[PDB]
Design a binder for these strands. Structure first.
Ligand SMILES: [Mg+2]
Ligand SMILES: [Mg+2]
Lengths: 124, 453, 225, 230, 350, 260
RNA sequence: UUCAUCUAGACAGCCGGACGGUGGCCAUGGAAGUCGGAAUCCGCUAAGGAGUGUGUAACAACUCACCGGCCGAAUGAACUA
RNA sequence: GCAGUCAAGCGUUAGCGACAUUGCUUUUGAUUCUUCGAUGUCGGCUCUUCCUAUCAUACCGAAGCAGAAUUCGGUAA
RNA sequence: GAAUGUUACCGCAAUAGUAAUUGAACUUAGUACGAGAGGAACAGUUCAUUCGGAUAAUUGGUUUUUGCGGCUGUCUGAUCA
C-alpha cells in the first residue's frame, strides 16, 4: 500500500521545526496512465517547504517519509498504521539537516536509511 | 568547468556533422506529402521540418560552445598553458566564427520560416525548403577547418593534466637528462619514461605523493636550454609559465657529471638569469647523479661556481641520485617541511577525585597471536567458506548450533516456544516445582472447602 | 588495530554493529565479509553473535551494553533474546527493559565505568542499567543534542564527539567522564561519529571515508598503539 | 588527463599479436566488402554510395593526372601579386507569369461572401514610403515577410557579389502595372546603389547607381540575384 | 498502452467442462522409477502459515514471515485402468483401453446420469469376458507392449471418502515417469485396485503447477470510438505454476496442523469448519499461494513439467505454526479449549 | 500575433505615440522597439506622452518631462474620459502634424506602451466618449481597431507590449500592470517590495494602523483588521496580497521615482 | 574494339640489389627520404625516388618505383553491347 | 541561385556538361534582446490496428574509448 | 440447434490467438583501470514499477442478515409483540 498521493501537505518530523511540506514530486514513482505518484513510508521524495523556517520556504528538498498513517500490509500479517503522516528532510544522500528528530520512526524507514536511524531515538 | 574537460562530445568533422544532422531531420520528420493535400497542411509540414533542422543545428552549436573550457578568465596558469598548446588567438577566433555561423543559421532559418508561410504551390514550398537547406549547408561548409582544429585541440586538451596551483605543491625542474624524470618516477607512485635523452617527458606529467598525512602533488618538465628569453620552444615556454605561476619552490636539478654535456658554468648562469623567478618561492637546489661524482671531490674552480649558488638567499644544495633512492626520502621530507613552513607563515580528564579504572583489554586479545591474511597458515575466516560455498548467493549461514551452552545436545534441539498456551518465557524459570508443590495443597483445600458440594 | 573497514556500501559501521570489550554484534544480513573483517582484528577472543533486533539490521543502535552486561529494547523478540542469552558470556546479563524509548545505542552511550543516559529516562530503567553495567549514571547532553549516543562515543580510553560541540561543553564532558576528549571527525566530517563507527580499548573500526588525519586523531585519542 | 602516454603503453606492450594480422585481413577484405555493399545499401543509400564512389574515382583520376604531368618535367604590379583576384538584355523573353492565383484572394468579414481582397504573392520592394493606409483601403496587400530591400548584384568581372540597397524599379514588362506595384517579377530592370564598387565614368563624375536585371526567381528563392547592366 | 486483458486469452467463452483437462505431461525420464506425473483433488479453503526461511542475501533472512497457503483435499485413490497412445502424423492416438472390472459404484455413477433411474447395467457384461482364466487382458498387455510407446493410467477419486458427501466421482488420465513402457504397464497391472498414497507422489518443498476453473460470475457483457472506417467473466480453465509445497498433510491422523515448534495438538480443520465445505479427515497437500476456483472445485497438481534448480525451489520450509482459527467470522481461537479458557464456564456448562 | 500587434500597428501607424506611467516612465521606455523604428522607419515621429500625471506630484511630473524633453516632445496627458488634462495640447499637436502632411490626405496614429497604462482610456477621452472597452484589467482588447476623428486622422488600438528580455526580473515586472495578479499562486513573496517604492507615511494614510516590521506581519495585521484572517490568527495572505497588488497597480497607494 | 608486354623467356608467385657526395639548402633541441618547405642534381650502373609506405627522439628496422636468380605461354590497361 | 574557374565525356567534329571550385557564405564564444498581414477549420480523450525514415531496452560495430561516461554508422517494431 | 444409428466417459489436434516487460542491493568492488579525481560487468542470489491469469485468510469503501441493542415521533386507547 502506497502512502500519501502527490501534493499531500505532510507535517515535518525533524527537530529544526517546520509547519508542513508539499510533495511536488516523487522519486522512483510508478509512472502509469491515470496512476499518480504516491510516496510510501521510507521513500525519498522531493517535497517543497510549504511553510516553515523563512529560509527553507519556497525551495524543494529531498524529504524522507517517517510515518504513513495508512493501513499497509507489512510482511508481518499485522495491519499497523500511525497517527499522522510525517517526514524528515535530508539531502539526496540522507544527510538530515537537523541534529535530532521528533516523534517515533518505523523500522521500514530506519533500515533503508542508516543515517535516519542514527538520527532517531524512539525507533518502532 | 576545470580539471580535465575531456567530457567534450568530440564533434565529428563538418561533413560528418552535416550528414548526421540531415539524416536526423529526414528520419525524425514525415516525408510522404502529396499535392492534393491542403496548402495549409503542406506549409505547416515544411515549416516544421525547417524549424526542426534549424533547432538541431542551433542545439549542436550551443552544446559545442558550452562544452569548451571557457578559456577567458579561467586562470592565468591555465590560460597561458592553453595559449602555448593551441595558440589562444586561433582558438578564440575559431569559437567566434562558430558563434557567427550559429547566428547566421538562426537568421536564415527565421527568414525562411517567415517566407515559407506564403508560398502557394507545393513546388514553391519545396524550393524554399531546398534553398534553406542549401544555405545551412553552405554556412556549415566553411566551418570545416575551425571544426577540425577544435576537434584536434579537444583530443589534446582532454588528456591535459589537472592540478590547482592554489593548492600546496612541490615541483621538480632542471636541465634535461639530469635524471629528473627518474627522480619524479621514484619519489612518487607515477610511471614515466626514463629514457636517456633531453626530451624524455615532453608533456608536463603530474605526480602525487603523500607526506605528513597530506597529499603533495608534483609536476615534470624538461627544463630550459640557454634560451636568452627571445628564442624559446613551446615545451620550454610551458615550463617557464608553470614556474612563474606555480606555488612554492620547484626543485632545481643539476647533473654534476660528464652527462648533460653543458659546462657547470652554463648551469649556474641558467639559474642566475632565471633568478627573477625566485621572488618569494624560497627555491631549493638538489644535485642529481651524486653517486658517480661525489661533489666533495670537485675542482676548486668548479666548487666556486657551486659556492656562488649558495650565495643567493634561501637556497640549499642537497645530494641525490637515481641508482640509489635513499636520498629521495630526505629530499621529500625537507621539501614538505619547507612547504608547510611557507604555508603556515602566510597567516582533559581533570582528575575528578573519584574515578578509578585500568585499560580493560581482555587477556585473550592481549595474548592472542597477530593475524596474517596473506599467510596460508591462518584462521578459517568463514568468509572463505562462503566463497567456496558459492558466495552469499547460496551460502546458508549456520552460526546457530555454534554457541556456548551447558551441553552439546542443546545445539540442535528445536525450542518449541509454544505448548498450546501462552509462551513459557513469561514463566520459564529453573526448578518449576516451586509452582507445582503448592498446587496440590491448593487443589485439596479448594475441594474440601464446600465450594463444589 | 585501527584498520579501515566498510559495510556493503555504507560507511555507518556502528549502525549495523556495536563492538564491546567482551563481545560484538553484527547484522545477519549482507555477507561474511563484515564478519571476517571483524574477526581479523578480533581474532577468536570473544563470540561474534550474528543476530537481529526486532527484525532490523540497525541492532548496533537499538541495543547497548558494556563488559558486565548487554541491554536490549522491549521491541526485541523472544527468540532474539534467547539467542543473545545463549550466545553471550555468562557474566553478561540481558533483560527486557520496559521503557518507552527504544534506541539504547542512540539514546544511551556508556563504557565499562561511566554511562550517560537521557535526562527523561525512567528511574527504574536507570537503576537496572546501573546494576547491569556496574557503572555510574549521569544526566547530561552534548551541546543540547538529545541523542547522546548518536554523537558521543566513549570507551575506557579517551572519547570522541562531533565537531559542533563547543570548547566549554567538551571540557565539561571530559571532566565528568574523566577521560581525554577531542572534538574530532569521521567519515569525511560526518556528525554521526557516535553511531557511524565502533571503537573500544583495543580495536577501532570506521568507514573508508575516514581520512588519514582522522585515523591519526582516533589513534591518538584512543592510544591503540 | 595523462597526455599521450597511450603511445607509451603501446610501445611497452607492442601491437597485440592478433592486431596486426586482423588489421591486414580486414584491409584485404575491404575490397570484397565494398563490392558486396555495392549490391547492398538499397534505396536512399545506394545513391549516396554511388555518388561517393564517383567522387573518389574523379579525385583519384585528377591526382594521377597531376602526378603524370609533374613527372614530365596578365601582368600585375609588384604590390598586387600574391593576392587574391546588340543591346539585348541577358535574359529576353522571360516566362509569362499570368494574371492568376498570384493575386491571392483573402476572405473578408465573418460571412465569407464579400472578399474583394487581392494579395500579391510575389516579392515587392517599396522602401520608406510605404505608409500602410487604413485597413479598409487594402485593395492590394504585399506581405512584409515577402519584402526585400537588398538584392544580390554581380557582373562578369572579378566575380564579386555585394549586397546593395534597391533604389527603384523602372521597367517591368508584361503589363508594367507590376512596375507601378514595385514587384520584382524576375526579368525586371531595377536600379541598385553601386556606390560600393565606385566605378567612375569618363569626365571624373563618379557613378554610384546603375540599372540591373534580376536573374534569379525571388518567388522560388529566399534571395534576390541581379546582374549589372554595364 | 496495454488493453483490457491479454489478446492470447481471448475469446473467453465458457469452459466445456468443469474438470480442467491436462494440456501436457512432464517428459518421461526412463532412468527414474515408475512414479506418478500428477494428481487430482478438491481444494477446501485458505489458511495462513507463519514461518521462518533460510534465504541468504534477502532482507528478511532468518526472520519469521507469514505467507498465504491453501489446503487441497486429496484422499486415497485407486487405479481403474490404463490407456496407451501411439505417435502418428495426426498426433497421439488412443490405441486401446483396459479395465480391472472391479469398478466401484462411484465410477458407475459418473458414467451414467440418472443413476437412480438407471437399470445399473454396468460393465458386468464385458467383465464376464475377463472373469475367466484370462488370456484377454494378456492380449491387451501384449498389444500395449508391442505398441503404445506412451502409456497414461486412469484413476478415480474417492468421492465417498471426501468430507463433502457425494456419490459421483471424477475420472482423468495420468501419465507415468518410469522406464520402458514394459515396466509402466507391468506396474499399472500390478497396481489395479491398489490404493494410491499422495505422499508417494510429492514431497516437501516440491515445486508444482495446477490447473482449475475460476469462479463464474454470470453474464458480463462506454466509448463510441472502437471501430475504424478504413461477454463472460469467470468459469474458464486457468493455469498457474511455481507453487511451493510446504508440508504433506497426513490428515488421517492427528498432529498434522501443529508443527514441531508449536506442537499444539490439533487438526487443520478450522474452528467450526471450512466455509461451504466439510471437515477434512483424510490425506491433503499444503501448497503456498492460491489456486483458481472455489471450494469443492476439482483441481489438478503437476510438477511443473520440468525440474528447476533455482534456489527458491531448493530452499526448505521451517513451519513454526499453522493458523486454524474459525474462518466463519472474526475468529479468535484455534480450538474449543482456548475459547473455554478465555470465556470460562458458560450457562451451557451448568 | 496577439503580441505581434506591436509590429502590426507600427507598420500601419504613420506616427507612434508612446504612453508611459508617470511614476516611472523609464520602465515603459524600452529601447529595443525605438532602435528598430530608427533603423527601419525614419518617417515616424515617435512622439511621447506622459500618462497618469495626477497619480504623482506635479513637481515630479515637471522634472520628468524636463528630463525627457531632450529628445521627445513629452506632452503631459491624463486619461480621464471627460475631465482629461492636456487634451487640448495633444489635439493641437495632431492638428499640426496633419497640417505638415496635407499632401498625404490620410494619416493614422498608433499607441505603444505597457498594458493598462493609458491606451484605451486615452483613445476614449480623445473621442470624448467610451468606445473601446476599458476596465482595471491588463487585457482590454485582443485585436486592433480603427477609430475616426476629424475625418483626416485615424487612431489604432492594440494590446499592451512587453518585449522579451533575459533581464525580465519577474519581481520588477509584477510591480506594473503587465501581470494579471489574479492568476499568481504566491503573491505574498512580492509584498515586501512595495515598501521600497511606496512611502511609509503614505501606507499609514491609505492603509489601516501602521508601525509594522517584517512585512509579513503587516499582512497579518491587515488580514486581522479586514476580517479575512483564518482561524487561529493565520492570515489569508493570498487574498490580502492579491488586494495589495491590485491597489498598487491601480495607483491607490501613491508612489513615484525621480531621475538623476 | 584499341594500345603495349613476348620465347632478345607473357602475367602472377618465392630470394637479393635498392649505392656513393649525403646526415642536400635553408627552417633548428630531431627531419639522416616519410613534422616545415624550393628545385629534385651530378658519379653510377640490370636499378635506385634528396623518396611510396610501416615505425622511430636520431638514424636505425622492413616493402616498392625500378632490376636480376627459379618458373614457363599468353598477359596487362582503357572502352562497347 | 547568379556569374565564373579546372574540364571525365558528348562535340555540325564554334557549344555543352558529371564531381569539385571562388564571391551573400560584428574572425575575439559579443548578444540581434528579431518572434513581421499563414483567412482555414479543428483540437484532445480513451482503446485498437499498420509502417520504420528506431527514443529506450536488445544486437553486435568505428572512435584520444584507459574506466565512469561520452560522439556516431548499421541490424532489430 | 440437424452433425456422427442412440447414449455417456476418456483423450489427440487440423485450426485461431499468444506476454511478459523494465529497473536495482550485494556478491565479484573501492579490485581491473586510476599519479590523483573517480571506478566497472561476466557468473548467483535478492528486491522493485506497469501489465496478464486468479481470488477472498488478513485491510479500506460499498449493507436488503433487517441481524443484534438503543435513540426521535406516530399507531393496534401511551406499555405488552
Ligand atoms: Mg631523461
Ligand atoms: Mg489596458
Amino acid at each position: 500500500s502506497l502512502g500519501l498521493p502527490v501534493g499531500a501537505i505532510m507535517n515535518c518530523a525533524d527537530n529544526s521545526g517546520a509547519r508542513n511540506l508539499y510533495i511536488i514530486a516523487v522519486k522512483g514513482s510508478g509512472s502509469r496512465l491515470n496512476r499518480l505518484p504516491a510516496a510510501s513510508l521510507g521513500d525519498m521524495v522531493m517535497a517543497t517547504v510549504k511553510k516553515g523556517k523563512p529560509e527553507l520556504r519556497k525551495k524543494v528538498m529531498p524529504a524522507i517519509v517517517v510515518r504513513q498513517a495508512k493501513s499497509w500490509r507489512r510482511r508481518d500479517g499485522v495491519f499497523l498504521y500511525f497517527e499522522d503522516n510525517a517526514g524528515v528532510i535530508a539531502n539526496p544522500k540522507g544527510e538530515m539537516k537537523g541534529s535530532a528528530i521528533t516523534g517515533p520512526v518505523g523500522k521500514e524507514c530506519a533500515d533503508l536509511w542508516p543515517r535516519v536511524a542514527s538520527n532517531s531515538g524512539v525507533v518502532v | 568547468m576545470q580539471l580535465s574537460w575531456k567530457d567534450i562530445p568530440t564533434v565529428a568533422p563538418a561533413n560528418d556533422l552535416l550528414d548526421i544532422v540531415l539524416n536526423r531531420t529526414q528520419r525524425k520528420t514525415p516525408t510522404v506529402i502529396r499535392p492534393g493535400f491542403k496548402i495549409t497542411r503542406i506549409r505547416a509540414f515544411y515549416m516544421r521540418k525547417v524549424k526542426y533542422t534549424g533547432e538541431g543545428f542551433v542545439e549542436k552549436f550551443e552544446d559545442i560552445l558550452k562544452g569548451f573550457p571557457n578559456i577567458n578568465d579561467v586562470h592565468p596558469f591555465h590560460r597561458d598553458l592553453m595559449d602555448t598548446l593551441y595558440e589562444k588567438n586561433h582558438y578564440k577566433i575559431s569559437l567566434a566564427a562558430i558563434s557567427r555561423a550559429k547566428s547566421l543559421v538562426e537568421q536564415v532559418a527565421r527568414d525562411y520560416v517567415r517566407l515559407l508561410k506564403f508560398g502557394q504551390s507545393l513546388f514553391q514550398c519545396k524550393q524554399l525548403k531546398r534553398a534553406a537547406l542549401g544555405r545551412m549547408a553552405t554556412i556549415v561548409k566553411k566551418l570545416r577547418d575551425p571544426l577540425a582544429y577544435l576537434e584536434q585541440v579537444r583530443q589534446h586538451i582532454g588528456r591535459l593534466p589537472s592540478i590547482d596551483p592554489n593548492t600546496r605543491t612541490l615541483l621538480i625542474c632542471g636541465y634535461p637528462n639530469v635524471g629528473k624524470s627518474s627522480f619524479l618516477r621514484c619519489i612518487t607512485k607515477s610511471d614515466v619514461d626514463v629514457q636517456p635523452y633531453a626530451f624524455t617527458t615532453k608533456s608536463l606529467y603530474v605526480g602525487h605523493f603523500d607526506y605528513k598525512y597530506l597529499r603533495f602533488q608534483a609536476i615534470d618538465t624538461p627544463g630550459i636550454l640557454d634560451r636568452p628569453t627571445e628564442e624559446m620552444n613551446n615545451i620550454e615556454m610551458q615550463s617557464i609559465y608553470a614556474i612563474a605561476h606555480l606555488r612554492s619552490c620547484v626543485l632545481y636539478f643539476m647533473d654534476l657529471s660528464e652527462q648533460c654535456g653543458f659546462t657547470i658554468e652554463a648551469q649556474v648562469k641558467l639559474f642566475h638569469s632565471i633568478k627573477p623567478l625566485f621572488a618569494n618561492k624560497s627555491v631549493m637546489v638538489v644535485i642529481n647523479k651524486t653517486d658517480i661524482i661525489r661533489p666533495e671531490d670537485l675542482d676548486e674552480e668548479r666548487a666556486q661556481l657551486l659556492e656562488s649558488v649558495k650565495e643567493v638567499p634561501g637556497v640549499e644544495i642537497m645530494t641525490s641520485s637515481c641508482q640509489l633512492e635513499e636520498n629521495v626520502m630526505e629530499v621529500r621530507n625537507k621539501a614538505c617541511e619547507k612547504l608547510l613552513a611557507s604555508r603556515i607563515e602566510n597567516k582533559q580528564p581533570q582528575a575528578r577525585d573519584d574515578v578509578k579504572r585500568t585499560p580493560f583489554i581482555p587477556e585473550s586479545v592481549k595474548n592472542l597471536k597477530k593475524y596474517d591474511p596473506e599467510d596460508p597458515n591462518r584462521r578459517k575466516l568463514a568468509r572463505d567458506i562462503e566463497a567456496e560455498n558459492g558466495g552469499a548467493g547460496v551460502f546458508n549461514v549456520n552460526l546457530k548450533d555454534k554457541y556456548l551452552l551447558e551441553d552439546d545436545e542443546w545445539k540442535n534441539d528445536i525450542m518449541p516456544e509454544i505448548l498450546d498456551g501462552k509462551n513459557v518465557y513469561d514463566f520459564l524459570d529453573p526448578e518449576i516445582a516451586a509452582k507445582l508443590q503448592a498446587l496440590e495443597e491448593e487443589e485439596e483445600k479448594l475441594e474440601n472447602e464446600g465450594f463444589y458440594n | 588495530m585501527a584498520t579501515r573497514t566498510q559495510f556493503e556500501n555504507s560507511n555507518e559501521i556502528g549502525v549495523f554493529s556495536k563492538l564491546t570489550n567482551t563481545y560484538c554484534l553484527v547484522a545477519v544480513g549482507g555477507s561474511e565479509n563484515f564478519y571476517s573483517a571483524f574477526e581479523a582484528e578480533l581474532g577468536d577472543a570473544i563470540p561474534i553473535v550474528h543476530t537481529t533486533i526486532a527484525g532490523t539490521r540497525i541492532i548496533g543502535r537499538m541495543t547497548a551494553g558494556n563488559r558486565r552486561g548487554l541491554l536490549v529494547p522491549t521491541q526485541t523478540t523472544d527468540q532474539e533474546l534467547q539467542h543473545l542469552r545463549n550466545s553471550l558470556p555468562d557474566s553478561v546479563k540481558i533483560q527486557r527493559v520496559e521503557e518507552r524509548l527504544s534506541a539504547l545505542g542512540n539514546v544511551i552511550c556508556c563504557n565499562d565505568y561511566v554511562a550517560l543516559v537521557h535526562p527523561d529516562i525512567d528511574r527504574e530503567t536507570e537503576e537496572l542499567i546501573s546494576d547491569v553495567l556496574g557503572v555510574e549514571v549521569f544526566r547530561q547532553t552534548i551541546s543540547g543534542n538529545i541523542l547522546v549516543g548518536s554523537y558521543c562515543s566513549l570507551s575506557n580510553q579517551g572519547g570522541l564527539v562531533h565537531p559542533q560541540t563547543s570548547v566549554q561543553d567538551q571540557e565539561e564532558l571530559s571532566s565528568l567522564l574523566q577521560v581525554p576528549l577531542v572534538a574530532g571527525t569521521v567519515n569525511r566530517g560526518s556528525s554521526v561519529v557516535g553511531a557511524g563507527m565502533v571503537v573500544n580499548d583495543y580495536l577501532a573500526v570506521t568507514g573508508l571515508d575516514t581520512t588519514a588525519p582522522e585515523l591519526s586523531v582516533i589513534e591518538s585519542i584512543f592510544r591503540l598503539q | 588527463p595523462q597526455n599521450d602516454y597511450i603511445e607509451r603503453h603501446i610501445k611497452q606492450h607492442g601491437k597485440r599479436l592478433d592486431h596486426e594480422e586482423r588489421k591486414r585481413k580486414r584491409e584485404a577484405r575491404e575490397s570484397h566488402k565494398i563490392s558486396e555493399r555495392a549490391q547492398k545499401l538499397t534505396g536512399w543509400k545506394g545513391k549516396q554510395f554511388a555518388k561517393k564512389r564517383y567522387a573518389e574515382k574523379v579525385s583519384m583520376r585528377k591526382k594521377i593526372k597531376a602526378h603524370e604531368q609533374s613527372k614530365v618535367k596578365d601582368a600585375l604590379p609588384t604590390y598586387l601579386l600574391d593576392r587574391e583576384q546588340k543591346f539585348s538584355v541577358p535574359l529576353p523573353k522571360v516566362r509569362g507569369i499570368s494574371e492568376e492565383e498570384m493575386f491571392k484572394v483573402i476572405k473578408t468579414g465573418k460571412s465569407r461572401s464579400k472578399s474583394w481582397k487581392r494579395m500579391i504573392t510575389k516579392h515587392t520592394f517599396v522602401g520608406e514610403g510605404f505608409t500602410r493606409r487604413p485597413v479598409k483601403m487594402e485593395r492590394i496587400i504585399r506581405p512584409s515577410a515577402l519584402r526585400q530591400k537588398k538584392a544580390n548584384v554581380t557582373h562578369p568581372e572579378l566575380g564579386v557579389t555585394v549586397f546593395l540597397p534597391i533604389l527603384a524599379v523602372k521597367k517591368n514588362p508584361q503589363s508594367p502595372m507590376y512596375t507601378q506595384l514595385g514587384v520584382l517579377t524576375k526579368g525586371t530592370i531595377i536600379e541598385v546603389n553601386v556606390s560600393e564598387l565606385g566605378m567612375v565614368t569618363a569626365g571624373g563624375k563618379v557613378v554610384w547607381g546603375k540599372y540591373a536585371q534580376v536573374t534569379n526567381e525571388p518567388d522560388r528563392d529566399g534571395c534576390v540575384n541581379a546582374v549589372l547592366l554595364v | 498502452a496495454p488493453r483490457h486483458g491479454h489478446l492470447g486469452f481471448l475469446p473467453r467463452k465458457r469452459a466445456a467442462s468443469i474438470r480442467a483437462r491436462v494440456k501436457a505431461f512432464p517428459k518421461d525420464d526412463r532412468s527414474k522409477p515408475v512414479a506418478l506425473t500428477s494428481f487430482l483433488g478438491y481444494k477446501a479453503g485458505m489458511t495462513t502459515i507463519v514461518r521462518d526461511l533460510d534465504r541468504p542475501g534477502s532482507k528478511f533472512h532468518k526472520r519469521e514471515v507469514v505467507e498465504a497457503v491453501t489446503v487441497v483435499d486429496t484422499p486415497p485413490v485407486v487405479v481403474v485402468g490404463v490407456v496407451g497412445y501411439v505417435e502418428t502424423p495426426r498426433g497421439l492416438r488412443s490405441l486401446t483401453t483396459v479395465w480391472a472390472e472391479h469398478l466401484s459404484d462411484e465410477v458407475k455413477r459418473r458414467f451414467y446420469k440418472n443413476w437412480y433411474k438407471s437399470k445399473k447395467k454396468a460393465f458386468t457384461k464385458y467383465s464376464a469376458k475377463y472373469a475367466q482364466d484370462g488370456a484377454g487382458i494378456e492380449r491387451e498387455l501384449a498389444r500395449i507392449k508391442k505398441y503404445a510407446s506412451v502409456v497414461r493410467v486412469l484413476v478415480h477419486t474417492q468421492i465417498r471418502k471426501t468430507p463433502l458427501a457425494q456419490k459421483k466421482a471424477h475420472l482423468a488420465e495420468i501419465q507415468l515417469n518410469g522406464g520402458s513402457i514394459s515396466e509402466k504397464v507391468d506396474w499399472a497391472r500390478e497396481h489395479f485396485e491398489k490404493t494410491v498414497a499422495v505422499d508417494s507422489v510429492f514431497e516437501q518443498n516440491e515445486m508444482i503447477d495446477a490447473i482449475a476453473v475460476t469462479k463464474g460470475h454470470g453474464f458480463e457483457g462506454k466509448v463510441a470510438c472502437i471501430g475504424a472506417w478504413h461477454g463472460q467473466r469467470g468459469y474458464h480453465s486457468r493455469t498457474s505454476i511455481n507453487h511451493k509445497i510446504y508440508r504433506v498433510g497426513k490428515g488421517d491422523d492427528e498432529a498434522n496442523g501443529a508443527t514441531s515448534f508449536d506442537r499444539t495438538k490439533k487438526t487443520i480443520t478450522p474452528m467450526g469448519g471450512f466455509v461451504h465445505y466439510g471437515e477434512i479427515k483424510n490425506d491433503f497437500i499444503m501448497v503456498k499461494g492460491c489456486i483458481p476456483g472455489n471450494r469443492k472445485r476439482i483441481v489438478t497438481l503437476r510438477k511443473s513439467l520440468y525440474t528447476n534448480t533455482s534456489r527458491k525451489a531448493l530452499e526448505e520450509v521451517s513451519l513454526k505454526w499453522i493458523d486454524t482459527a474459525s474462518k466463519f467470522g472474526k475468529g479468535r481461537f484455534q480450538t474449543p479449549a482456548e475459547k473455554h479458557a478465555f470465556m470460562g464456564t458458560l450457562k451451557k456448562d451448568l | 500575433r496577439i503580441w505581434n500587434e506591436l509590429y502590426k500597428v507600427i507598420d500601419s501607424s504613420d506616427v507612434v505615440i508612446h504612453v508611459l506611467d508617470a511614476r516611472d516612465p523609464l520602465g515603459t521606455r524600452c529601447k529595443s522597439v525605438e532602435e528598430y523604428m530608427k533603423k527601419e522607419t525614419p518617417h515616424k515621429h515617435l512622439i511621447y506622452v506622459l500618462n497618469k500625471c495626477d497619480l504623482v506630484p506635479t513637481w515630479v511630473a515637471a522634472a520628468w518631462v524636463k528630463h525627457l524633453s531632450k529628445e521627445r516632445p513629452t506632452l503631459a496627458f491624463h486619461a480621464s474620459i471627460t475631465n482629461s488634462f492636456g487634451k487640448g495640447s495633444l489635439i493641437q499637436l495632431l492638428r499640426q502634424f496633419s497640417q505638415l502632411h496635407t499632401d498625404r490626405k490620410q494619416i493614422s496614429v498608433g499607441f505603444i506602451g505597457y498594458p493598462n497604462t493609458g491606451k484605451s482610456s486615452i483613445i476614449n477621452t480623445l473621442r470624448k466618449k467610451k468606445v473601446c472597452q476599458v476596465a482595471p484589467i491588463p487585457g482590454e482588447t485582443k485585436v486592433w481597431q480603427y477609430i475616426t476623428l476629424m475625418k483626416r486622422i485615424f487612431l489604432i488600438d492594440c494590446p499592451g507590449i512587453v518585449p522579451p528580455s533575459s533581464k525580465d526580473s519577474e519581481e520588477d515586472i509584477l510591480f506594473r500592470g503587465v501581470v494579471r495578479v489574479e492568476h499568481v499562486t504566491h503573491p505574498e513573496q512580492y509584498i515586501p517590495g512595495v515598501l521600497k517604492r511606496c512611502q511609509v507615511k503614505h501606507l499609514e494614510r491609505t492603509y489601516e494602523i501602521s508601525g509594522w516590521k517584517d512585512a509579513t506581519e503587516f499582512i497579518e495585521i491587515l488580514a486581522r483588521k479586514q476580517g479575512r484572517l483564518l482561524k487561529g490568527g493565520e492570515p489569508d495572505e493570498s487574498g490580502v496580497s492579491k488586494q495589495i497588488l491590485n491597489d498598487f497597480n491601480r495607483g491607490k497607494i501613491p508612489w513615484f521615482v525621480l531621475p538623476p
